[PDB]
Amino acid sequence: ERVFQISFFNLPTVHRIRDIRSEKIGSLLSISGTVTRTSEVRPELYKASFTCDMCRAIVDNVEQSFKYTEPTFCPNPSCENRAFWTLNVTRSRFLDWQKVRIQENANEIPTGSMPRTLDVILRGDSVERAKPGDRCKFTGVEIVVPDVTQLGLPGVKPSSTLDTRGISKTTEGLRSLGVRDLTYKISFLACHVISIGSNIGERDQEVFLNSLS
Amino acid sequence: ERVFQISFFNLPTVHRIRDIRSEKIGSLLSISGTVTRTSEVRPELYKASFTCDMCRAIVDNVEQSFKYTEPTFCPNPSCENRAFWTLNVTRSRFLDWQKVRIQENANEIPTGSMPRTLDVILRGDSVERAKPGDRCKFTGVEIVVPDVTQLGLPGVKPSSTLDTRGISKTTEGLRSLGVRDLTYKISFLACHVISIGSNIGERDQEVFLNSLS
Amino acid sequence: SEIHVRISDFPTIYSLRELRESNLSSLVRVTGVVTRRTGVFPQLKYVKFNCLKCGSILGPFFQDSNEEIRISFCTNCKSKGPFRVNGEKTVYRNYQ
Numbered sequence: 380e381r382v383f384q385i386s387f388f389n390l391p392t393v394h395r396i397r398d399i400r401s402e403k404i405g406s407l408l409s410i411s412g413t414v415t416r417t418s419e420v421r422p423e424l425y426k427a428s429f430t431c432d433m434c435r436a437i438v439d440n441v442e443q444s445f446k447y448t449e450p451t452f453c454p455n456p457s458c459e460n461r462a463f464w465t466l467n468v469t470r471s472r473f474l475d476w477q478k479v480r481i482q483e484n485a486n487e488i489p490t491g492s493m494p495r496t497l498d499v500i501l502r503g504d505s506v507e508r509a510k511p512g513d514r515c516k517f518t519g520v521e522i523v524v525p526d527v528t529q530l531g532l533p534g535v536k537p538s539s540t541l542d543t544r545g546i547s548k549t550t551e552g553l554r555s556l557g558v559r560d561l562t563y564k565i566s567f568l569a570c571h572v573i574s575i576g577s578n579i580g581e582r583d584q585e586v587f588l589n590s591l592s
Numbered sequence: 593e594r595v596f597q598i599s600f601f602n603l604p605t606v607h608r609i610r611d612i613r614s615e616k617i618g619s620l621l622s623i624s625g626t627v628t629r630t631s632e633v634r635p636e637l638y639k640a641s642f643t644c645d646m647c648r649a650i651v652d653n654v655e656q657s658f659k660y661t662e663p664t665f666c667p668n669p670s671c672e673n674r675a676f677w678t679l680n681v682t683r684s685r686f687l688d689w690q691k692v693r694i695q696e697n698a699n700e701i702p703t704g705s706m707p708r709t710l711d712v713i714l715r716g717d718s719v720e721r722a723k724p725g726d727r728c729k730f731t732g733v734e735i736v737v738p739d740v741t742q743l744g745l746p747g748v749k750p751s752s753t754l755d756t757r758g759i760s761k762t763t764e765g766l767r768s769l770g771v772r773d774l775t776y777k778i779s780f781l782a783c784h785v786i787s788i789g790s791n792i793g794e795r796d797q798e799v800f801l802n803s804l805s
Numbered sequence: 806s807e808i809h810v811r812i813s814d815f816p817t818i819y820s821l822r823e824l825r826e827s828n829l830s831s832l833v834r835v836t837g838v839v840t841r842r843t844g845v846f847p848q849l850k851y852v853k854f855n856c857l858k859c860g861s862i863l864g865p866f867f868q869d870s871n872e873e874i875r876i877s878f879c880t881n882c883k884s885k886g887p888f889r890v891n892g893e894k895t896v897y898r899n900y901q
């Protein structure tokens with residue numbers, strides 16, 4: 380089964396980097412910026428393959444949603460444990476992955492502020508269509524990425540505590556719980572990349588002349 | 593597969609229970625004696641099936657030779673250890689087994705000694721052909737059975753030590769060896785049981801008249 | 806006790822920028838300039854272990870380049886405890 384990529388383009392409105400807000404997270408958007416850095420094309424784990432330790436039997440086609448996940452279903456009835464698994468990258472499935480860093484355009488920068496960068500990620504056929512030093516229009520989805528650098532920032536950082544109300548307990552003896560911080564930053568996942576002119580407004584001659592009407 | 597049993601009979605010479613010597617161990621033999629005690633019919637593990645603790649895959653049709661054995665092959669390549677197994681009694685194969693105790697005939701007992709017993713073991717179709725209180729002639733093989741009661745007997749009891757000559761060792765640090773006691777007693781494994789007359793020389797009339805010439 | 810086969814004249818030639826998801830676990834032929842190299846290091850090839858209880862040196866186990874190998878049974882004292890690799894009897898191959 381092949382991977383299909385749906386690319387949307389030509390949105391009515393193109394937003395700046397500074398107009399990116401949190402109410403548009405997980406929504407279709409079109410932004411623009413100057414590419415300053417590009418990354419190497421790397422494989423991203425799409426459909427992982429896992430072996431249970433006790434089963435020693437493998438399962439296939441496990442969907443990976445951003446952060447690395449392991450299924451707890453374990454359809455083989457040999458064992459009774461769910462958490463322990465082992466990843467095999469030989470028969471797992473991957474996708475193309477590139478992370479290009481974009482910067483605010485020179486005319487879009489406000490009166491006193493410095494330009495702010497954004498790490499926009501290209502997958503599939505859109506990889507390597509972005510080049511360092513040109514203005515590009517990225518159409519995609521505003522996604523959210525875990526961030527660790529917000530630990531010392533002011534303000535109440537949200538946290539996720541496990542709800543214990545329907546769990547029966549006994550005071551037999553012989554009280555630890557798993558709580559994690561929810562700190563995040565805004566990233567972009569682009570499906571279509573078009574390179575607008577770096578100006579205000581392929582060496583062979585034949586390939587250039589077929590381009591013109 | 594059907595289990596076949598070969599029964600030999602009409603041996604040229606019938607030996608006494610005191611004529612039993614260790615030179616005939618593992619040999620075809622014919623004895624006679626008076627049955628005193630019979631056990632009930634019990635299942636004996638013939639073709640055992642084991643599951644490996646790490647494989648969770650079963651291997652079947654393992655030969656069982658007297659004392660309980662576990663294979664060390666582990667033909668499935670999932671794990672790398674051999675000693676660990678779990679026995680399944682439901683799908684394993686068994687045999688009929690009866691331990692019948694015989695005593696020396698009163699005319700065969702020597703001048704001063706008391707009669708001595710022997711536990712002869714019947715398997716297959718020969719089971720329950722021996723009845724408490726009759727003189728029976730058993731044809732089979734003189735086998736040997738591990739015995740614990742010979743601990744305090746005088747004389748040098750043979751022992752089995754593991755030979756350590758061709759193994760490479762280092763004195764790095766952080767000396768135990770497995771040694772077994774070889775003490776045994778003579779038993780009988782009968783394939784054919786015939787009940788000769790308890791005298792010196794079936795209620796229906798028709799079944800009795802069918803036997804006579 | 807080891808012969809390496811060196812495949813030559815592979816027909817397709819790839820550059821480093823067009824390596825993709827489809828080339829994973831496959832034979833590729835890429836041109837390039839060697840920029841920096843590390844020193845020659847010994848990588849385990851025929852790994853021999855020893856048991857810490859009895860001291861017996863266990864038989865050689867082949868080390869593949871994919872991942873570390875490990876054992877848990879002694880075949881002499883029948884224990885699952887700590888085993889240690891000794892470099893005196895272990896065979897090594899060059900790595901760069």
Ligand SMILES: [Zn+2]
Nearest residue numbers: 431434453458
């Ligand atoms: Zn499992």
Ligand SMILES: [Zn+2]
Nearest residue numbers: 644647666671
């Ligand atoms: Zn196994």
Ligand SMILES: [Zn+2]
Nearest residue numbers: 856859879882
């Ligand atoms: Zn050991």
